[PDB]
Design a protein around this ligand. Structure first.
Ligand SMILES: CCN(CC)CCNC(=O)c1c(C)[nH]c(/C=C2\C(=O)Nc3ccc(F)cc32)c1C
Ligand SMILES: CCN(CC)CCNC(=O)c1c(C)[nH]c(/C=C2\C(=O)Nc3ccc(F)cc32)c1C
Lengths: 277, 270
């Protein structure tokens, strides 16, 4: 907001495509030739904290920020371009990922969460659609629009219901919650990647919240049992823990068998980006 | 009385259309009638849609599991106003009158729609206005000490539905609020606060000192219409009028309301 450039962004950037719907364009720094992504939102001068959260980030797993432009009542946010788009854009064509593929993504997201949490920040919208893959098979985090800055417990009722932790769903009754909700959202996201839908996705979202506040609510499991390994079923069991008091941190999960086992690298995602042909 | 056969044995799948299971244009094999089929307490929508014989409620033909229903050619009002733009205060007024008749019959049947919105109001090629998608509709029965479920589409919900506190609950008068929001939607193409996160919208509706929305530009709209918004979007359910009561408001009982208005709108499309 204070480091905004009052400049037409088209001055130094060729816009190349429409990808969004706020709207999001593929662009190119004219002099540099470097690709970027410009998120444009129409702004009547009469929730822009996403800027505050990104400008202060400095991590490979978090989408990179380059500056914000404001022109003619239009707000443009310049960020790091990711060739293959979201994992949702991908898996919809590809089909469900392998366990190694899923394993890699979780390690990378947990890397981005660990950093983000130590910065005293929660994403609160971890889902396949907010995880971006660059042409080099790398993983980045995006859509910090509903993400929160702490400085100790959040009170807001927000998220995408299917991916929302139960302590968030019940926030109006159970009081504040904290950063362990991104770990729940990650577990759901693992299943999203495994089954192409999050659990209960055909249920009305508001109902899925109510259901998940019920006493005796059972956290989701993977459907095909034998299809996945012992290490994966456990990763789900523990990430999807109801009591946030008992649910592991990002740091503790990075040392889990599923994400600590060898073989995991940006290669498996390139192997996934091949199936897009 | 759900059939174990195949929906295609009576009908056809000739085009595709937009509500959970998708909609598909269809033709009766024997007579030549057009129907739309939806492809998916499982038997809840069909039980409400059966036991419904009213002009403003989309017809019901059978179910198998594809719920077979009357075909509407001009899709939803939402499909239409994405082409046409702001409906005129008259066309809105007709639609509202038409929807209230729908709701008044529904309430007298102890039914509540709970998802009144532009997207769920269907216009057939005859210019008839119908209400569809009873996927989250209620049927008040003999259940003792019931509290109605936390469900809907936030932008269109009445504040009393947004409450999850122990103290509260709602009745059929939630529909009258939804209708109010729908009128602004038909008028400004967006319900109020559409740019807000929908779960944040639910939170605001419950806070101390919430104010119902009103039409954003005053001059464009009459005082009957401005008033119509005011009363349908009454914050307190006790003070909010009923379907029957609304049908005699200045706006929906004014002279000039005939299907003709809808037919003109169906030419903005052509
Ligand atoms: C693969 C399926 N489709 C085939 C053309 C493409 C669909 N998806 C695409 O094109 C796509 C691409 C190539 N980038 C993005 C989004 C972002 C990006 O790159 N950096 C960001 C930073 C922040 C943010 F909020 C979004 C993005 C999409 C949706
Ligand atoms: C993009 C705007 N276009 C209109 C100009 C869309 C074209 N037309 C369309 O999308 C469309 C048509 C022609 N029918 C429907 C849906 C239903 C219908 O007909 N009977 C029902 C009964 C129940 C129900 F749950 C849905 C429907 C759509 C979305």
């Amino acid at each position: 907001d204070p480091d905004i450039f009052n400049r037409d962004p088209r001055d130094h950037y060729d816009l190349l495509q429409r990808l969004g719907g706020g709207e999001v364009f593929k662009a190119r720094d004219k002099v540099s030739g470097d690709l970027v992504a410009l998120k444009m939102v129409k702004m009547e001068p009469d929730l822009q904290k996403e800027i505050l959260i990104l400008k202060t980030c400095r991590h490979a797993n978090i989408v990179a920020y380059h500056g914000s432009y404001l022109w003619l009542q239009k707000l443009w946010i310049c960020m790091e371009f990711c060739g293959a788009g979201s994992l949702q854009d991908i898996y919809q064509v590809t089909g469900s990922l392998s366990e190694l593929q899923i394993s890699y993504v979780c390690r990378e997201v947990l890397q981005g969460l660990a950093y983000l949490h130590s910065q005293k920040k929660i994403h609160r919208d971890i889902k396949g659609a907010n995880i971006l893959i660059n042409d080099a098979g790398e993983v980045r985090l995006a859509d910090f629009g509903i993400s929160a800055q702490i400085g100790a417990r959040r009170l807001s009722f927000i998220g995408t219901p299917y991916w929302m932790a139960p302590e968030v769903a019940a926030v109006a009754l159970k009081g504040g919650y904290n950063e362990l909700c991104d770990i729940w959202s990650l577990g759901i996201t693992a299943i999203e990647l495994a089954e192409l839908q999050p659990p209960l996705f055909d249920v009305h979202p508001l109902r899925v919240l109510f259901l998940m506040t019920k006493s005796g609510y059972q956290p989701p499991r993977l459907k095909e049992k034998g299809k996945w390994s012992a290490a994966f079923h456990n990763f789900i069991k523990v990430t999807l823990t109801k009591s946030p008091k008992k649910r592991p941190s990002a740091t503790k999960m990075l040392s889990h068998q599923l994400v600590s086992q060898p073989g995991l690298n940006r290669g498996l995602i390139l192997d996934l980006l091949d199936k897009l042909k």
